[PDB]
Design a binder for these strands. Structure first.
Lengths: 187, 175, 168, 75, 159
RNA sequence: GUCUACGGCCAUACCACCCUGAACGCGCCCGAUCUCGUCUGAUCUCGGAAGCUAAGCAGGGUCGGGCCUGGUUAGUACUUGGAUGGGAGACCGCCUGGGAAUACCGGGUGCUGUAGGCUU
RNA sequence: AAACCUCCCGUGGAGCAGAAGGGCAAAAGCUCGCUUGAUCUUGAUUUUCAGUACGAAUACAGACCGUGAAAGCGGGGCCUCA
RNA sequence: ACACGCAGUUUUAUCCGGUAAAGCGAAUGAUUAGAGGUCUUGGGGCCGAAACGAUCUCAACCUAUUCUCAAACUUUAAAUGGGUAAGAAGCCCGGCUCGCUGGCGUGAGCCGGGCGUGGAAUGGAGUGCCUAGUGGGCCACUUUUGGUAAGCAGAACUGGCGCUGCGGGAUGAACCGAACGCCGGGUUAAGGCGCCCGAUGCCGACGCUCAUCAGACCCCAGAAAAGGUGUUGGUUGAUAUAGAGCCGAAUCAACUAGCCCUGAAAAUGGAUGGCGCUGGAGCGUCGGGCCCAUACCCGGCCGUCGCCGGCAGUCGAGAGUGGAC
């Protein structure tokens, strides 16, 4: 006879990756041991990000990684990205880097190796710095997907700039009553 | 308000001091209640009814039980009552014969409940006074004022009926 | 006359269940850590505490606990909240680890801080898990009415010790 | 075949099931709903804040030197 | 069903009190308001332009915009599912300064004074407010005169 | 002590009658050429300083009306919460907290900001 | 008893178009003199709200104006419906 | 060994209201009755040719009173309740920008520096998407609309049934207690303890009650006004040895409150649940003792949630060092 609301007693956070691939599970075991032994929170963050789904770890662009490493203070530090590193074609000068990532695109890998940089996997990063010392943790833009453009306040509402679900943009598919001031109203 | 074997309590209390009135007067009451908590509650009720004083706006300086001065002496207690019936309220004066004032008050409560179906919350006691053999108006208590008292126990209805339930001898009621 | 000081702390026990409870009464009961029936908790007395107890007066029976009552409650049914877990106070190490920053290192220090309300009474009482008292042996007078009118609810300052003896 | 017209019996319980909250207060609130002349003046001030940056930097350096002298005198 | 009129049910709200009709006092006109000022809204029947809605009467909000002779104020309004902070434009006569924040500001100044003081002395002073404590047990002196006995008054039919 | 100009709070300031105002000041008051507007210099405007506290105004008084603030009304009416309380009901009583308003009886009859005068 | 003129009292007990409520006394009423802010154009907000429209309304801003000596007021009707 | 924020809560200060209540000797409307008024006029009348000359009267009005009212009245005016503030997103300085505003000044925005537990108690919080079913409700304390009333229709807060089992009310939607994993022991709530049926098989306490229609426990299943010297208490008022011819000590009257009775009549035979109960097994105030539900305490087992959970193979229990040289 106790009044406790069991509505949110079960936490929905992930515990193991849903992927059935074996290399990711081996990395999960390694970082589980590292997080439960070492006092560093870097291992815990890396394990949590490894648990995340594909959409929750967007790819990181080479230009974004370059601009994040160019910040003063993180000189000679290894970049740790749980997603994938993708080449950026609109950048010419690429300094040498120390990048740790699950995957790297072929073009980005060629660019980094030609620039004189070094690319490491997560097991190599664990062997080098078990507690993640001298590491810069980076991630891609979470809201970069076009899916989030359709989220938020619904269209046809004042002060809303949400992209509606339209079969094909055009003159006679929208921008009519509800959007034109000359036809009914607008928001 | 419930009732049991009631006890008399002297309760002195006063409203909390104020900048305008540094020394408020103290008020004393005699409350017949089973315990000190209900005694203080009844004291606050009567004080609120009589004067402009509330429990939050006042404090009980001292609540203490009053013991009977002559427990071994038989006395006549006259009690003035003001109770609420189904109709409008009425005033009554009753007389009882007992050894203690608290016992007399308890007997008065029981008699009121038995004869008028009056509840303790509806019963308000004003004054209980010990009186001599004279000044008694109730024949029920006057009949016991006799030096050479003499009466038998005519029909001695036996008890222990469920002590051995089946017996050869029928019981006896004359002794 | 000598008017004794108003007690600094009081013991409150929920006497009725969770079925058919007003929203405000339920909110105050769950703020006083009184969720299950027959649960006791020490609450220090002030204006706000007295007003809350007045609000949940029909649903609780409360009074002024005695030193023996505090000793028995802390010893026999004393549980501490460590890592959000109810753990029995079987040794002073748990109390030292939890309330070491407050000068409380043993059951005696905890009892002293609970009884003589000090600076860290809040921390001591929050560390103390609410006491899951058993049903009152010998029965009750009346659950649904106030103590003054023959019931058990309300303020029973001194008789709360008898209630603790019958329940603990 | 008449039906019930209007009632709000369970509405409070429905509202409080999710625990209705006060609006999220955030610092640096929006400037929507401010008079256009004031908005223009604030925009001009923000645009021209870059003017006289060296004067502010020199004044800050002088203040830092004064604070250093004061703390050296204190110690 | 009821009508959705703007001034429906405001027979007594938007009405001046007794013997206070006529010309509006000029102190309300000549008192200033800044941004972020806590202000309680009270409609006035004399002035109709810029009159706030009946739902905002008595509600208190902060000022975010100040026009020539009106104030933009954000107030919290609860509508059946949630509380929304919405901005309304209210003329000067329907607006008053709130002293609730001033009471807190005075205490803040006192705390600053009492922290500047008693710091070189080393004696830590209690800054936090405290609820009503026990009544600090004391003695009551019954100097000579005994407490007055109170006898309940017997009932008598008056009416 | 007090007056004028501009005010703040808008009767403790209002209303009726009676008494007193030394000086400045506020006004009554004398005329219509000029400025001004009316049927009428009645109002307003203008040009004045022979008379006056007659009036306005200021101060005081009325066992004054009113107004403001207190006691009484009254812990009364009412009211949050409670009961397997009473009653056929109408309604009422009790516990727990808050707490009114008439009649009736007392006190008072404007404070104050800026600038400029008189009693030097 | 009710035509016109004069004096006094007169808190509004009249009037403000309408139904009612609120509001107003050197006005928001009556009479005068000038006028068409009942003009044009972006936005923001309020009332039923789902916080969507329509209708109505509120503070602004950018131009042309009206009036008054000026402060100011006015982008329809003193406000709540048309 | 190291906490920011949030809340059907309260407290401290600040505002909001016009409902209960109260008033109409205060505004509006209704309304009774007397005193002073040719106030003012007018009708019937009588003494008068008439006359405000005397006499009242009825008509609307006044001057001080008086009786009763208002959901669409109010000078007043609660209880409950509704917004706020209780600090780092705050204060104190120094300097810049402004096509805005101004005599100097404001006001806003920019940068640099100094100051931390800001009332009580409890909680870990915030955020984004896919989203089934529902859009016939009903009952109960309190307030309240129409109706004579309705197990009627329609509203406000809260709680229930719906979606809910369990103990009690014999029976049972909504009542009281109390909410559910499978068990052992103990104790209770609401209710009860003559038998059905677990427990008063107490040497229970004090009083009332005779019914040829007794009475027997919230919702609830049934009664009214008026009466009774039937009986048990209370209030008030008189007279009685100066006697209420004889007997001889207490007596009479008006109210009022308890139990019982008349009032009290429906149809298959009939229901305090039945038997039955009257030194109660009825009624009112109450004592101990006892009986027990899936309710509370201890323990065993199953599953769910949480542990910034532990174990890849190591020292170590308020941990507050180890090890060269």
């Amino acid at each position: 006879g106790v009044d406790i609301r069991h509505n949110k007693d079960r936490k929905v956070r992930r515990k193991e990756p849903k992927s059935q691939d074996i290399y990711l599970r081996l990395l999960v075991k390694l970082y589980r041991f590292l997080a439960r032994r070492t006092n560093s929170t870097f291992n815990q963050v890396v394990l949590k990000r490894l648990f995340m789904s594909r959409t929750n770890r967007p790819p990181l662009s080479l230009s974004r990684m370059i601009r994040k490493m160019k910040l003063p203070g993180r000189e000679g530090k290894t970049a740790v990205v749980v997603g994938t590193i993708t080449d950026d074609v609109r950048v010419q000068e690429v300094p040498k880097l120390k990048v740790c990532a699950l995957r790297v695109s072929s073009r980005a890998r060629s660019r980094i190796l030609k620039a004189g940089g070094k690319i490491l996997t997560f097991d190599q990063l664990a062997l080098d710095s078990p507690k993640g010392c001298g590491t810069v943790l980076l991630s891609g833009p979470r809201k970069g997907r076009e899916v989030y453009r359709h989220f938020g306040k619904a269209p046809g509402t004042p002060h809303s700039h949400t992209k509606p679900y339209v079969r094909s943009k055009g003159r006679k598919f929208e921008r009519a009553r509800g959007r034109r001031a000359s036809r009914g109203y607008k928001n | 308000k419930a009732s049991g074997t009631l006890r008399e309590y002297k309760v002195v209390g006063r409203c909390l001091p104020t900048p305008k009135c540094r020394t408020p007067p103290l008020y004393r009451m005699r409350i017949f209640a089973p315990n000190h908590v209900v005694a203080k509650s009844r004291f606050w009720y009567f004080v609120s009814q009589l004067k402009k004083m509330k429990k939050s706006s006042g404090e009980i300086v001292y609540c203490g039980q009053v013991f009977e001065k002559s427990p071994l002496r038989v006395k006549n207690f006259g009690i003035w009552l003001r109770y609420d019936s189904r109709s409008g309220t009425h005033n009554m004066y009753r007389e009882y014969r007992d050894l203690t004032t608290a016992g007399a008050v308890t007997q008065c409560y029981r008699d009121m409940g038995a004869r008028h179906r009056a509840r303790a919350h509806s019963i308000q006691i004003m004054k209980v006074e010990e009186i001599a053999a004279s000044k008694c108006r109730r024949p029920a208590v006057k009949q016991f004022h006799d030096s050479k008292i003499k009466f038998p126990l005519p029909h001695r209805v036996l008890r222990r009926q469920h002590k051995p339930r089946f017996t050869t001898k029928r019981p006896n009621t004359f002794f | 006359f000598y008017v004794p000081a108003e007690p600094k702390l009081a013991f409150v026990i929920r006497i009725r269940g969770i079925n058919g409870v007003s929203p405000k009464v339920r909110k105050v009961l769950q703020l006083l850590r009184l969720r299950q029936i027959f649960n006791g908790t020490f609450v220090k007395l002030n204006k706000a505490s007295i007003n809350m107890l007045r609000i949940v007066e029909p649903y609780i029976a409360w009074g002024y606990p005695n030193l023996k009552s505090v000793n028995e409650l802390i010893y026999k049914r004393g549980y501490g909240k460590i890592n959000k877990k109810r753990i029995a106070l079987t040794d002073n190490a748990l109390i030292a680890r939890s309330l070491g920053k407050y000068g409380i290192i043993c059951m005696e220090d905890l009892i002293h801080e609970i009884y003589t309300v000090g600076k860290r009474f809040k921390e001591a009482n929050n560390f103390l898990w609410p006491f899951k008292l058993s049903s009152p042996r010998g029965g009750m007078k009346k659950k649904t009415t106030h103590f003054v009118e023959g019931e058990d609810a309300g303020n029973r300052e001194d008789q709360i010790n008898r209630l603790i003896r019958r329940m603990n | 075949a008449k039906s019930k017209n209007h009632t709000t019996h369970n509405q409070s319980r429905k509202w409080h099931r999710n625990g209705i909250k006060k609006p999220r207060s955030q610092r640096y609130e929006s400037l929507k709903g401010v008079d256009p002349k004031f908005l223009r003046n604030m925009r001009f001030a923000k645009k021209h804040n870059k003017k006289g940056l060296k004067k502010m930097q020199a004044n800050n350096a002088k203040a830092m030197a004064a604070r250093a002298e004061a703390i050296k005198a204190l110690v | 069903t009821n009508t959705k009129g703007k001034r429906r049910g405001t027979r007594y709200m938007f009405s001046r009190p007794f013997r206070k009709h006529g010309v509006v006092p000029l102190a309300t006109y000549m008192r200033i308001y800044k941004k972020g000022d806590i202000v309680d809204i009270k409609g006035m029947g004399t002035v109709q332009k810029g009159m706030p809605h009946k739902c905002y009467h008595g509600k208190t909000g902060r000022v975010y915009n100040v026009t020539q002779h009106a104030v933009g104020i954000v107030v919290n309004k609860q509508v059946k599912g949630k509380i929304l902070a919405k901005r309304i434009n209210v003329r000067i006569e329907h607006i008053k300064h709130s002293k609730s924040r001033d009471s807190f500001l005075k205490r803040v100044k006192e705390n600053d004074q009492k922290k500047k003081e008693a710091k070189e002395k080393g004696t830590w002073v209690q800054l936090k407010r405290q609820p009503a404590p026990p009544r600090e047990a004391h003695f009551v002196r019954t100097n000579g005169k005994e407490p007055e006995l109170l006898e309940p008054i017997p009932y008598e039919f008056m009416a």
